[PDB]
Protein: Lysozyme C
Amino acid sequence: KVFERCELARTLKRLGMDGYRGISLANWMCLAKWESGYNTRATNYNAGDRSTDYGIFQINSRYWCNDGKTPGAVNACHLSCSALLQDNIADAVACAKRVVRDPQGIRAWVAWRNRCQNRDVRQYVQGCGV
Ligand code: NA
Structure:
């Protein structure tokens, strides 16, 4: 599914993302926007290293979820990558929280650096009641 902006903001708040490991809600929103356009079924194959990015947060099969076909991969969220293509985002949120528990934090996603870091990100949550 493709969330509307404020619908996702309210959903993420209920799921405990606001301030998780120091990361504001507006930063999570900015990341989902630039990774997937708020689309849970989004996938991107990376032909250069044979891994695939999955779902609303584009989580990578080399480190985070298992898809069987990625060489040298681990599965730190302990999920099939299929779990990250569901319309219900509970598992993908649980996996995103595991990602930012490593030292890099939100910097793990290069699009956060290019598109969100040191910007005015208030725009993503304005008017949503969160
Ligand atoms: Na994996």
